[PDB]
Design a protein around this ligand. Sequence first.
Ligand code: FMN
Ligand code: FMN
Lengths: 191, 190
Amino acid sequence: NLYFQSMETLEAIRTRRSVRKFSDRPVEPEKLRAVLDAARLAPSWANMQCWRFVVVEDQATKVQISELSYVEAYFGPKGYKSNPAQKALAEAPVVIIACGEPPQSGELRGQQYYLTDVGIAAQNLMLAAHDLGLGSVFVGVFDEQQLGELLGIPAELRIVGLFPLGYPLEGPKAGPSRKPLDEIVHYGKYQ
Amino acid sequence: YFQSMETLEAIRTRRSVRKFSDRPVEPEKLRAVLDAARLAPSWANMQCWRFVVVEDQATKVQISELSYVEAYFGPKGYKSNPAQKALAEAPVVIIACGEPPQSGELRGQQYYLTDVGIAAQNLMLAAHDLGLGSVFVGVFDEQQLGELLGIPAELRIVGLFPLGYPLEGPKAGPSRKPLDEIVHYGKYQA
Ligand SMILES: Cc1cc2nc3c(=O)[nH]c(=O)nc-3n(C[C@H](O)[C@H](O)[C@H](O)COP(=O)(O)O)c2cc1C
Ligand SMILES: Cc1cc2nc3c(=O)[nH]c(=O)nc-3n(C[C@H](O)[C@H](O)[C@H](O)COP(=O)(O)O)c2cc1C
């Protein structure tokens, strides 16, 4: 169809969900290019565009990636005792590996803005995917050392997120909650 | 009231806006911009971001004055801060903060920065969609800004966002690298 699932911007922002169950239906090359181009058009620190995307479609490689995305029992990061998106990395027809080059973005106040820049691009990627009737999910749980070795990624590049990309197998699950605007927004100075 | 846009078109045409009129921002539009940010995905849905909304003129002027680039050892890519005046000019400044321990801290990476980036992009896309302009400002004296606004030191300030109606018609943005420069297909050989 290419255009049937098109949405108004605010509607796409509202209805976008993390998708973790994918059909094996292939992703049209046109849609993949559009999703990646959306990432390309993100703003970045001084327009340095420090993001780099490795796009994997090979089945054997995707299984190997999925096997590097388990949580180490009891040594998991905050909030993931397991990785609900682990199977998605094998099952989705495409996996986009989003990387950043740290010295190619702001490094001040002990903050490394390549992480911010990749976040911005990732959100363009995920909104564009959703706009085109695809699903995706940001995967932050992965063994970076082993994944870098598997993929042969240049040493200077830091891996930030993995993105399964494909057609959702099922309809929109009523996702997790959000905090009320009153909890996350404060008006004026604070005393 | 806004000229609605298809998602991909908003993504493509959103620009950093640094020149603003004094036209008031409808409270409904401000709410919608903040709601867009609220709806962003985050590490384990932790929603570590916090936003401070400043409208007071004197306070915005003071924020602007803390957003200079230092003479030497200034941040990479900014020999000056083209958005500095926008902070005083815009009707609204949104200060985006995050809590480092409320997001991923692993591999020496602090995902609060990623989470705030994701939310900021929702904010900027929604603003543009609604006929407003914004720009992500990363240059600021954090200690002084936190003191000015009463942000507890345990919250880190990540970005400042002037928000208002663009003074001028849409401008051409700077370049982007061609897609082949930022995308590689398949694993690497050797
Ligand atoms: C993390 C981050 C920090 C930024 N900091 C500043 C800043 O301090 N001053 C400024 O004028 N622009 C800033 N920008 C805006 C970029 O310069 C702008 O996004 C880039 O040149 C691309 O232009 P566009 O947004 O019009 O596409 C920042 C953007 C990002 C993503
Ligand atoms: C930086 C980041 C890392 C994430 N990592 C994972 C992950 O490793 N595994 C997973 O299943 N989901 C992951 N997610 C998805 C979040 O769990 C999800 O965005 C959140 O629960 C909100 O749900 P929604 O995206 O459907 O609105 C991640 C999201 C972000 C922003």
